[PDB]
């Protein structure tokens, strides 16, 4: 919708995707897949499924990663659809930019397993690689949308049951508030074109399963927020989640927390899936592999 080509081609991607006709569970998830589908795998990207606890997984590394340093990776999809299938082109160009390596995971999804069982996933996960000698130090958590407020709920769990906390957390677009109350879900809801507040409260309605809207670990807008590591929040300026991801920033630093927020202008939805044909995809994601260095790094 602003203009460069690169970004032009990305939108008419997504804009083509959200015109799709669809009508199954099944039909949206393998439409994602598609929309994401010709991008391929880098040649040299080393990938390797395997059960974490229990929990479906994917190690994803580049030539050379340090094979110590992990960025433990919760997918978007509104907590219903995406897998590796449609975030691993994207996780493994994080992986170089940081040289570390990305375990992303195949978490559980509604409406058949409902809220909260991505955040016993995401713990049973991080339990795997303490139980497998991997340092909390050297251990970041990332996600996006969905994800992205997993990160934070997941980070939250993880103090409240007393496990050494990781040493960040990075959050993509982070959907943190069920009930879409941010202004730009009124603001931007002409300006976004993949994201807007009916599909998000129908998506937080199956993953809930009639469970409370607001109970902190689906909203962590109402968490507490108290000991949480440094945060790296992305978020673009035509989002209609942009005041989620400003919220987030907000209430994290009157925790106490080292967060810092980057609202990109004119990106769309977790624009950094589009890296490999997009020129703010790599920036940003080379502002994550800098951030990811420094912490775990």
Same mark, same amino acid.
């Given at each position: 919708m602003a203009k460069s080509p690169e970004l032009d081609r990305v939108i008419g991607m997504i804009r083509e995707r959200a015109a799709t006709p669809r009508k199954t569970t099944d039909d949206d998830r393998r439409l994602y897949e598609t929309m994401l589908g010709s991008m391929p795998l880098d040649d040299d990207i080393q990938t390797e499924?395997?059960?974490?606890n229990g929990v479906p997984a994917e190690w994803?590394? /580049?030539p050379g990663a340090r094979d110590d340093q992990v960025f433990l990776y919760l997918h978007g999809g509104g907590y219903v659809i995406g897998s590796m299938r449609t975030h691993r082109v994207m996780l493994s160009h994080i992986a170089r930019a940081a040289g570390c390596r990305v375990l992303g995971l195949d978490y559980?999804? /509604?409406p058949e397993t409902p809220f909260p069982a991505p955040v016993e996933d995401t713990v049973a996960a991080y339990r795997w690689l303490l139980a497998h000698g991997y340092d909390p130090s050297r251990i970041a958590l990332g996600g996006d949308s969905a994800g992205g407020g997993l990160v934070v709920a997941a980070l939250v769990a993880?103090?409240?049951?007393?496990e050494p906390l990781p040493a960040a957390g990075v959050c993509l677009s982070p959907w943190i508030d069920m009930? /879409?109350?941010g202004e730009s879900?009124?603001?931007n809801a002409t300006m976004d074109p993949s994201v807007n507040k009916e599909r998000v409260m129908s998506i937080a309605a199956l993953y809930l399963g009639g469970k409370n809207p607001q109970a902190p670990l689906a909203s962590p807008l109402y968490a507490d927020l108290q000991g949480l590591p440094p945060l790296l929040v992305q978020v673009g300026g035509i989002e209609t989640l942009l005041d989620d991801a400003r919220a987030l920033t907000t209430r994290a630093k009157a925790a106490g927390v080292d967060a810092d927020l980057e609202v990109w202008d004119d990106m769309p939805h977790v624009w950094q899936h589009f890296a490999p044909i997009l020129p703010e995809g790599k920036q940003a994601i080379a502002r994550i592999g800098e951030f990811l260095r420094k912490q775990i790094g």
């Open positions: 499924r395997l059960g974490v994803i590394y /580049a559980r999804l /509604a993880l103090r409240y049951i007393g009930e /879409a109350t879900f009124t603001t």
